[PDB]
């Protein structure tokens, strides 16, 4: 259950009660589509249905022809597998492995073993189930349903080609054409991972797609194979807390804690994720990619309870930009009201239920439905949870404008204090 704590001292709110799902690795699987080497239907005729088949075959052939024309690094794992498949003889390993089965584990040249699955076999359908239907002597097809089912089978290839063409062979998220939900669910079950990870990934397949990649690998020897790069969640169920920060100004000099974003416990240390796009959030599970993470000591949590703790140097910025704004946190909203701008909190039925005075203040999502700051109307999150207000004297009142260095784009508590002490030393 989610719990929010607003700290009036630093105008920051921490939304605890979350559980982690941190992507610490990648799982690369090879998805193969066996392609027919057909060039055309041999006969020519005036049948309208066969012309539709030829039109669909032209779509098929053009799709194959289109495919043949094709900090960290997010696809380094799938690119590595793709480059191995380009080596001589590695395609025939996949061809022989999937000769009698649709799933196989293939040991490549590097020694890595990758699970290979054949999700579609157009070579079988076209050569064995489509071409024998065509009466070459009359160049006619008996039933129209053959045309319709050919369009359905070929449709997945056309959409896979369509996505690779516009994404230059690397698509993210992995769509349902690359890997259907049943295939993705079965693929997760087939991964050599613990049951806790399988339960986590199966319940959140929509998050798995958003964090996955599809890499077009080979189009050679009647095989269309692309590497799907699924995420591995090695860290699960560890506590997470999101730090929401809003400007804190005198009522002038402003102060804002810059270290906002998600924090999660990881192997005795705190993984900090500054970018907002990094972490996807579910009911109470936070899916943060560790590639965009900073590893911090566990003492980083002490900045919430004590901004002047000696165990850590909390990051803040200093400026004179006394502009009113509101941060719509979970279970509430931080409202910073300054100047002549009027800030109010409103309810759907009762209307304006609170008028914010000058300073930084917090309103829970209970009762409040919208927040108005200046000319901007903010809607608050209606998540169920318990919000806690921690009253305290704002830290911005301890400084003085004469020596406050109000130009730090990114600094820390100790850096500001040392720079202040330098100002006092000169003065």
């Amino acid at each position, epitope marked *: 259950n989610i719990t929010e704590e607003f700290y009036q001292s630093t105008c920051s709110a921490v939304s605890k009660g979350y559980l982690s799902a941190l992507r610490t690795g990648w799982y690369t699987s090879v998805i193969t589509i066996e392609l027919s080497n057909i060039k055309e239907i041999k006969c020519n005729g005036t049948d309208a249905k066969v012309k539709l088949i030829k039109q669909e075959l032209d779509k098929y052939k053009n799709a194959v022809t289109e495919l043949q024309l094709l900090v960290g690094s997010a696809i380094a794992s799938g690119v590595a597998v793709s480059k191995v498949l380009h080596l001589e003889g590695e395609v025939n390993k996949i061809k022989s492995a999937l000769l009698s*089965t649709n*799933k*196989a*584990v293939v040991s490549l040249s590097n020694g890595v*073993s990758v699970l290979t699955s054949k999700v*579609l*076999d157009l070579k079988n359908y076209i050569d064995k189930q489509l071409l024998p239907i065509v009466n070459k002597q009359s160049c006619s097809i008996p039933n129209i349903e053959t045309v319709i089912e050919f369009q359905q089978k070929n449709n997945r290839l056309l959409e896979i080609t369509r996505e690779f063409s516009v994404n230059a062979g690397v698509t993210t998220p992995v769509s349902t054409y690359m890997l259907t939900n049943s295939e993705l669910l079965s693929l997760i079950n087939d991964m*050599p991972i613990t049951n806790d990870q399988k339960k986590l990934m199966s319940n959140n397949v929509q998050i798995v797609r958003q964090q996955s990649y599809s890499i077009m690998s080979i189009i050679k020897e009647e095989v269309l194979a692309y590497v799907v790069q699924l995420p591995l969640y090695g860290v699960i169920d560890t506590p997470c807390w999101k730090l929401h920060t809003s400007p804190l100004c005198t009522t002038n000099i402003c102060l804002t804690r810059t270290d906002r974003g998600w924090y999660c416990d990881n192997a005795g240390s705190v993984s900090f994720f500054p970018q907002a796009e990094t972490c996807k959030v579910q009911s109470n599970r936070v899916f943060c990619d560790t590639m965009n993470s900073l590893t911090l000591p566990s003492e980083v949590n002490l900045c919430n309870v004590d901004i002047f703790n000696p165990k850590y140097d909390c990051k803040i910025m200093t400026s004179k930009t006394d502009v009113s704004s509101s941060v719509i946190t979970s279970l509430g909203a931080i409202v910073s009201c300054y100047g002549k701008t009027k800030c109010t909190a409103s309810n759907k039925n009762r209307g304006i239920i609170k008028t914010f005075s000058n300073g930084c203040d917090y309103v829970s999502n209970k009762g409040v439905d919208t927040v108005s700051v200046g000319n901007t109307l903010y809607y608050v999150n209606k998540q169920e949870g318990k919000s806690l207000y921690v009253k305290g004297e704002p830290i911005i009142n301890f400084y003085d404008p004469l020596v406050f260095p109000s130009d730090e784009f990114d600094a820390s508590i100790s850096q500001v204090n040392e720079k202040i002490n330098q100002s006092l030393a000169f003065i």
Partner: antibody
Amino acid sequence: VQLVQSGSEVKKPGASVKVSCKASGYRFSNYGISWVRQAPGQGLEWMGWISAYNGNIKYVTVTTDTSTATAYMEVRSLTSDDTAVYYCARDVPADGVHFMDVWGQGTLVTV
Amino acid sequence: VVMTQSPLSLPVTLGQPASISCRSSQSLVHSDTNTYLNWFQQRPGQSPRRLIYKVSNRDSGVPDRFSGSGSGTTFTLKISRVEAEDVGIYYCMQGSHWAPTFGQGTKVEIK
């Protein structure tokens, strides 16, 4: 590529017998093992499948030892109806289609 | 998936052809257009060996006399010329569905 099983076993009802299956000629971890029962005068019957890649199990307790490339099947509460030949077949490593290309010579368990 | 197999006994004169049919209760066409139907042979005193691994694909080392045919729910195994080494029990198997199932088996003899 071959599979060799344990010798014939004679047991009394209510006991437990663990058949083994030693693999050679291929990478054990790239496949799974399917166990098939053949009662005398009766057709083949699929019992269970264990993957050497995932550890996944389908259906008696089947286990695989990757280090020794050996698969085990233990049948508990043996009855007179459990007198049959038990085969191990190399199978799909994941939830695909089963093929059972290579079979062990067969362990005759008598109860 | 019940794999009905017919006939159960197939006494065949040497050199004459033999046909074994095996009809499934459901269509064996998988999500991918393949139909994973296997044919096994159990030589007397030996473990079953795979002959045909998809409806018509002979396995490596299988003589050309063994031909597989069929589609959908009905399948056929044919031997062009029955020799002394063709005596055995033949099982059709499907691996497409969750649980592999075998046929009742066909006992081929010599008249």
